[PDB]
């Protein structure tokens, strides 16, 4: 599935792109969301390519993000016990594998906030004036969204 | 008026004869030069343009005159076939009050061009190739745009 | 006359020259059936046709050749043959379920005493409803046997045959 991370703010931006962004739950820089791989989401992500990065996410990075920056209803940290007693998978790693396989989703965790609020990228990123093919950080990354996501643990 | 007054392409074309009025004539008399009835010149070089602009007809006439003189002086009267290509279809207008009803009136004619678009073409034998280059280099000196020379046919012969 | 890409070629039924589309547009505005009375030399044809986006479906189609069963052993190109054909067509269509429509003569001259108006007479006398006026209906003096009198006096066996065919037409369709 995709991993959309916002990296530019919201001043001097078209209203169509802004409304697509708010429809994707992304309101602030350094915020991440996880969406399935279907043509609707593919087009929606294609329309905001110059303000977010994205790519294919693996099991390890998703499990790490869930264990670190997962909040419940009311700003309550997510723990192993919540996963092991609400859903059926043993630990965060098994649930992450199930989610990435498409056999499960993040809707199976009650009171889970859809948006993930990450930390600014340690060591600094490439730059928000160029796309990936130009030597920057915006645009499609393919499988290398894990490097940027791990950098923003 | 000066040359740079009407040389840029900033506005739409203005060429419909039946709507405007009183366009002055032209000076360029003949658009084909030299041996028209010959068709057996193995080398065919030409002068091309490096940038979009407008060329007045007077500049074209001066370039044609100078190229004709050089080519006839060196190559010979029957040893070439020069042919101008672009005809001036545009019309030039000069305001002449202040800005009150500032729309102008016809004063001349111009021929728009496009990058890498051929203007002149000279065909010669093998022995008069350098004279052809020498002739085409002076003609581009009267022209309002940077110009380069390309050998279209018989490149292997000369090169 | 296709000489270039701008040339305009007419419709297929206009190139054939067997239709008039302005008349067709005027006729379809009635929202109701049409009666077609196209004729030829060896016989006459009558049929009821209604429109559809694909084609023109037809419900009843009677032809003057059908008098051979009844016994109309006379000429099939006369007015009385047209009257007989129209009469049996009217009875057939009435019993079938359809009753009315509009008269449509196509690209033919509408002149009183014609075979088309003879067929119209045969239709109207049968009970098949149709809008018309009587002044164009041919008088029965030519209907019976008397439009061939002046050249075929040796053949005046018409009126008895006409009566027999009329009574047999009534007998079959009643």
């Amino acid at each position: 599935m995709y991993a959309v991370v916002r990296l530019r703010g919201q001043v001097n931006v078209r209203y169509t792109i802004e409304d697509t962004m708010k429809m994707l739950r992304l309101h602030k820089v350094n915020h991440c969301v996880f969406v399935p791989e279907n043509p609707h989401y593919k087009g929606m992500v294609q329309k905001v390519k110059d303000y977010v990065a994205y790519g294919k996410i693996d099991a390890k990075t998703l499990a790490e993000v869930l264990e670190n920056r997962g909040r419940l209803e009311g700003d309550t940290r997510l723990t192993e016990e919540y996963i092991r007693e609400n859903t059926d998978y043993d630990s965060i790693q098994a649930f992450a594998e199930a989610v990435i396989e498409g056999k499960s989703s993040l809707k199976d965790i009650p009171k889970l906030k859809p948006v993930f609020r990450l930390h600014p990228p340690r060591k600094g990123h490439a730059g928000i004036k160029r796309t990936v093919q130009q030597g920057g950080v915006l645009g499609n990354h393919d499988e290398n969204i894990n490097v940027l996501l791990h950098k923003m643990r | 008026k000066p040359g740079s007054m009407y040389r840029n392409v900033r506005q739409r074309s203005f060429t419909r004869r039946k709507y405007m009025g009183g366009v002055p004539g032209s000076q360029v008399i003949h658009y084909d030069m030299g041996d028209k009835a010959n068709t057996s010149f193995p080398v065919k070089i030409s002068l091309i343009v490096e940038e979009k602009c407008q060329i007045r007809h007077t500049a074209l006439e001066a370039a044609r005159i100078t190229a004709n003189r050089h080519l006839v002086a060196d190559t010979g009267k029957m040893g070439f076939y020069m042919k101008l290509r672009v005809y001036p279809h545009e019309v030039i207008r000069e305001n002449k009050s202040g800005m009150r009803r500032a729309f102008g009136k016809n004063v001349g004619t111009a021929a728009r061009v496009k990058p890498m678009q051929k203007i002149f073409t000279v065909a010669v034998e093998k022995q008069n190739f350098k004279a052809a280059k020498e002739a085409l280099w002076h003609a581009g000196q009267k022209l309002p745009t940077p110009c380069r020379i390309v050998v279209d046919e018989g490149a292997e012969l000369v090169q | 006359m296709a000489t270039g890409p701008r040339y305009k070629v007419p419709f297929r039924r206009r190139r054939e020259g067997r239709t008039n589309y302005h008349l067709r547009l005027k006729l379809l505005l009635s929202r109701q059936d049409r009666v077609v009375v196209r004729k030829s030399s060896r016989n006459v044809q009558i049929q009821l046709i209604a429109p559809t986006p694909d084609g023109d479906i037809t419900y009843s189609s009677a032809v003057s050749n059908e008098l051979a069963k009844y016994g109309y052993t006379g000429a099939t190109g006369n007015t009385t043959a047209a009257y007989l054909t129209g009469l049996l067509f009217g009875l057939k269509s009435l019993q079938k379920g359809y009753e009315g429509g509009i008269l449509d003569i196509g690209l033919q001259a509408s002149s009183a005493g014609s075979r088309v108006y003879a067929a119209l007479k045969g239709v109207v006398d049968s009970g098949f409803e149709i809008p018309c006026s009587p002044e164009v209906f041919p008088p029965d003096e030519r209907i019976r046997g008397e439009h061939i009198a002046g050249y075929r006096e040796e053949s005046s066996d018409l009126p008895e045959q006409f009566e027999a065919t009329k009574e047999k037409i009534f007998a079959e369709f009643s």
Partner: protein, 96 residues
């Protein structure tokens, strides 16, 4: 001054294709619609009568009723609803 009549800026709007001029097909005039049936506005220049304002060209309305030989449509312009009368010769169904 520019005029503001009812046929302004319709040089190409009210033209017919080169292999279309003349008598239009007649079956298009006898098509019949029911209530709540989406249709397309496509003005046929060959017919002079019963023509909506050409600003409704290319819009889609739904049929509301019939007045004689003309259907009543419900077209959206901007954020309003406009009721437009049009004979069935200018209309065209929606293929689902």
């Amino acid at each position: 001054t520019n005029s503001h009549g009812e046929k302004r800026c319709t040089r190409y709007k009210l033209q017919k294709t080169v292999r279309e001029r003349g008598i239009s097909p007649v079956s298009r005039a006898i098509q019949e619609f029911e209530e709540g049936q989406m249709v397309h506005i496509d003005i046929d220049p060959s017919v002079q009568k019963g023509m909506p304002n050409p600003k409704f060209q290319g819009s889609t309305g739904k049929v509301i009723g019939q007045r004689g030989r003309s259907y009543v449509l419900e077209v959206r312009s901007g954020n309003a609803m406009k009721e437009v009368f049009s004979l069935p010769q200018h209309l065209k169904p929606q293929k689902y």
